[PDB]
Design a binder for this molecule. Structure first.
Ligand SMILES: NC(=O)c1ccc[n+]([C@@H]2O[C@H](COP(=O)([O-])OP(=O)(O)OC[C@H]3O[C@@H](n4cnc5c(N)ncnc54)[C@H](OP(=O)(O)O)[C@@H]3O)[C@@H](O)[C@H]2O)c1
Ligand SMILES: NC(=O)c1ccc[n+]([C@@H]2O[C@H](COP(=O)([O-])OP(=O)(O)OC[C@H]3O[C@@H](n4cnc5c(N)ncnc54)[C@H](OP(=O)(O)O)[C@@H]3O)[C@@H](O)[C@H]2O)c1
Ligand SMILES: NC(=O)c1ccc[n+]([C@@H]2O[C@H](COP(=O)([O-])OP(=O)(O)OC[C@H]3O[C@@H](n4cnc5c(N)ncnc54)[C@H](OP(=O)(O)O)[C@@H]3O)[C@@H](O)[C@H]2O)c1
Ligand SMILES: NC(=O)c1ccc[n+]([C@@H]2O[C@H](COP(=O)([O-])OP(=O)(O)OC[C@H]3O[C@@H](n4cnc5c(N)ncnc54)[C@H](OP(=O)(O)O)[C@@H]3O)[C@@H](O)[C@H]2O)c1
Ligand SMILES: Nc1nc(N)c2c(-c3ccc(F)cc3)cnc-2[nH]1
Ligand SMILES: Nc1nc(N)c2c(-c3ccc(F)cc3)cnc-2[nH]1
Ligand SMILES: Nc1nc(N)c2c(-c3ccc(F)cc3)cnc-2[nH]1
Ligand SMILES: Nc1nc(N)c2c(-c3ccc(F)cc3)cnc-2[nH]1
Lengths: 251, 251, 251, 250
């Protein structure tokens, strides 16, 4: 049968691009989403029109809480319930906003969302994925090429993405005896936030040596597809920057 | 007016050495503890014998929870109460134990303790330290030289220490305009766990190129003292390995 | 028109596998060799049997000397003379042997180890770029996953490979305006030396988390093919580890 | 008896401040220089006026060539000749200029930039180790911007990367002899002699910590730490002294 993949935060933007590319490659997909129900259902509809019974949606909040482990177990279970297997996990869902150190949400809510989505949920999903297991099993974590030259006032987000690098390495080591590879893809500037005005987008665009433009969602998805493929069967613990040289540019 | 320092987890082992060496350098010190009340007090007694009213203690659990931000505010407050200023924060307190990915603390308790002590508490203490502020202000975070070659089955602990590296860099960037430096000290093998088998201890000792032995607590403290000193006033965002070459040794 | 690639040290082992996969993908190839003339010719004849006039050989010593710049220019010029174009350069040729700190003179060792692993790649990169100034131009440098946990007594080899990482980053930045991408592939343990006893090969194989085996030459080649492909069009300055997790394993 | 240190490129700027600071700490010093003879001799005069017989100069070209090993052996030998011992080596001398990929030959640029920044440190390390209570160590002056390099400085960057590799390899291999090997990595410190207020202030405003360059003395302070008894478990470590520069995105 066809293999099956879970993509977190897959309703739009880079997560959609990944789910679409996995689907085009032959995977059945679980489209996880949090708030973007209409978009997630519209995506599953398109994929199922292309090949019937190959896409399902799965709603979950990935904020840290005492029930997050159950939520993550349920996401993996949703892939087994729909498709009878789960070959690939892509940890894409991410909260992203500033948390200034010196002066809406309480700080503990900010911790829970920013560390939950970027690090704890990937950890719990990785535990569940491994516990439920020819084969080409792997996990791909969406990291950040700018983790060591971070945006000002984004400490909790940056902490979250560092922890995710840690996870990628720890889980690669620990899951290797089970034949589960664990890798990352690290965008620099890809799709800019929808709220950002064009002038500010262009400022970011002009920082990128390779073409003075952001990565397309497809360009990010391409590196994901490589890492899940048979062409990466000896690669584990590796994080591939997809940044057009941005991380190499000094202040 | 002598400067004042907060050292978390300062009752025993490396935290104690750091507190002692800061005191010997002329600092007044807050000795934070969780369970080691008798030891913390015994340390403060020894230090106040040398110099009267230059050491106090402060109890707090640094597990993440709804009350952690208040507990961290009060640690910083205890330094301002006792001494009228707070020049140095040392984030040393740390939970450490395995959290295997594949199979009586629940996983979310493990998250709260390992991520709370190694990363969230340092973030919250950093916030409180900064908000409450010629001077030589700095923060020193106790990291881990082996973050990129982690111990097997220590994912959460490793995620915690990676997040602490992220905080070190983010806070160095953001707090530099206030003259607050933020740095790290990364031990390799220092004081081995009290519980560990003596023959296990020697296996780790034999791995160290420089001397085939662990670092003393004083050797770790030595790097801390350098970082807080006037001879490090241009250093921020730096993490100093104190590992006798261990991290350079291949498998 | 079919694109063309230069592969240095392509007669045997990993370089051979790279040349073969590039050819299978549709490239015309220049097979550079130093001493392995019979193997190089055997490869060219095998490839030209598949498609006539698609493989040539080129001989050169890549040891550093007064004539190295000329030799590197000529290698690049051979691709243009043979094929009318040069789209891809793979810097694969490498001297490798110990140089302890405590019959070749030391300056010969410097010339060979730094020449092949670093200087020749730099001069080849200059010549490649000078001859340029639809298309997908890129350079791929064969690096080493173990560069930060080096083999004992291999200082000059390790220096060479570090210089090569530096060149990969510097050239990525500088050549990005010309649309030339520059990346690396970093093996850990791949094909072990031919004369090495199996019992010694096994000590290395047993260190690899993912399968307790070395990478095949084709597995290394797969990563090269990705980097040169249309699926890596935003990737520059990136070094892909292909190491089965070896570099994450502590001593 | 006083320990002794070799400092390469010690006539001016950062190397000079390192030599002065080691001397203040109690070391006898060899002041290596290439072209700065007057500044070198002037410095040794100053130092020897403070404590007699505690500074010598030693001239050498550290460009790579078939005689570089001899020149490097001679630098180390000069320390033993003057002082009967060699406790510390500081690899500070460095050529620095652009080598774009697209009136010196390219092989001269390779020789100078890779020689001074990497090969000479390697040969000096070999000679130092072969000639060997004690606290023996080597400190290499690296570069905090090695992973965000200046445009068109490929050979220089290659040199400094190779110097990181040397720092790690030599730390590993020399640990069984008790020789520690470490680095200090400036970001922006004393700006080039040829550079205007606009361009100097351009670099200054990039630095988070004070919007200024490091003083030479601030770089020397980290060197002093690493050679000290307070760093006896530290080997293979590189200390950035950059005021946060390397943390700032494009
Ligand atoms: N875009 C870039 O330039 C860039 C740069 C560096 C790294 N990255 C990384 O690449 C990945 C994709 O980036 P992106 O810009 O496409 O992401 P994004 O649009 O910011 O977020 C992707 C999805 O994350 C999900 N999410 C957010 N909070 C959540 C929560 N509490 N629970 C569950 N899901 C939640 C949302 O799902 P709903 O919409 O369903 O609510 C959202 O669509 C992320 O991991 C990101 O950090 C992106
Ligand atoms: N020892 C090593 O070889 C080594 C190696 C690498 C890194 N490090 C790092 O260096 C630092 C010191 O190491 P160490 O071995 O001295 O540490 P440790 O003995 O494991 O722990 C230090 C203190 O942390 C405090 N702590 C633990 N859980 C806590 C909680 N939930 N709330 C508040 N405080 C808590 C404890 O205080 P109470 O006793 O008062 O409960 C404990 O005494 C740590 O950050 C560690 O990760 C050490
Ligand atoms: N095999 C591994 O496990 C491993 C591990 C880490 C990194 N790598 C890297 O991957 C690449 C390929 O590895 P490999 O094991 O296949 O390499 P290799 O067999 O050791 O060397 C490849 C070729 O390098 C050429 N070469 C050597 N000295 C030369 C000189 N002075 N001038 C010109 N060419 C010279 C030789 O060509 P002739 O035979 O024609 O003389 C040789 O066949 C190298 O860059 C290597 O450092 C390999
Ligand atoms: N200044 C900074 O901002 C900065 C930033 C990053 C890294 N660094 C590193 O810190 C160290 C000192 O920096 P600096 O700016 O003080 O250095 P510098 O003034 O550029 O150079 C120091 C000395 O190196 C010597 N030198 C140059 N070419 C030589 C050769 N062929 N043979 C022998 N010696 C040679 C020169 O000696 P003579 O004058 O006697 O000819 C020169 O005085 C260097 O390793 C540098 O790369 C500095
Ligand atoms: N979840 C998530 N969404 C994002 N838009 C980002 C970005 C990003 C990167 C560049 C930019 F100008 C704005 C945001 C960086 N990291 C992100 N993570
Ligand atoms: N908080 C804390 N306590 C510790 N004992 C450690 C160690 C450590 C390091 C080496 C070893 F053999 C056992 C434990 C590593 N990291 C630690 N963190
Ligand atoms: N040019 C070149 N050839 C090689 N055989 C190597 C190796 C390698 C890696 C493992 C081993 F046991 C022996 C050599 C590591 N790096 C290399 N480079
Ligand atoms: N030998 C040597 N000399 C230097 N002046 C440098 C610098 C440097 C750093 C900043 C700047 F604006 C100009 C030069 C960076 N690296 C150097 N190396």
């Amino acid at each position: 049968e066809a293999p099956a993949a879970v993509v977190t935060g897959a309703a739009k933007r880079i997560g959609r691009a990944i789910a679409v590319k996995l689907h085009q490659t032959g995977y059945r997909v679980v489209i996880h989403y949090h708030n973007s129900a209409e978009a997630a259902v519209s995506l599953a509809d398109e994929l199922n029109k292309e090949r019937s019974n190959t896409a399902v949606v799965c709603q979950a909040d990935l904020t840290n809480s005492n029930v997050l482990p159950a939520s993550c177990e349920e996401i993996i279970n949703s892939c087994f319930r729909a498709f009878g297997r789960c070959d690939v996990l892509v940890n894409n869902a991410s909260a992203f906003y500033p948390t200034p150190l010196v002066q809406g949400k309480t700080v503990e809510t900010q911790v829970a969302e920013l560390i939950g989505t970027n690090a704890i949920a990937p950890f719990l999903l990785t535990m569940s994925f491994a516990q439920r297991q020819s084969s080409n099993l792997s996990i791909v974590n969406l990291c950040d090429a700018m983790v060591d030259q971070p945006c000002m006032a984004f400490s909790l987000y940056n902490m979250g993405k560092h922890a995710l690098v840690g996870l990628t390495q720890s889980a690669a080591l620990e899951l290797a005896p089970y034949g589960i590879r664990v890798n990352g893809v690290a965008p620099g500037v890809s799709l800019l936030p929808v709220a950002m005005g064009e002038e500010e987008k262009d400022k970011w665009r002009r920082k990128v040596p390779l073409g003075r433009r952001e990565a397309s969602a497809e360009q990010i998805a391409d590196a994901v597809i490589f890492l899940v493929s048979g062409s990466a069967q000896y690669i584990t613990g590796s994080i591939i920057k997809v940044d057009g040289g941005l991380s190499l540019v000094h202040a």
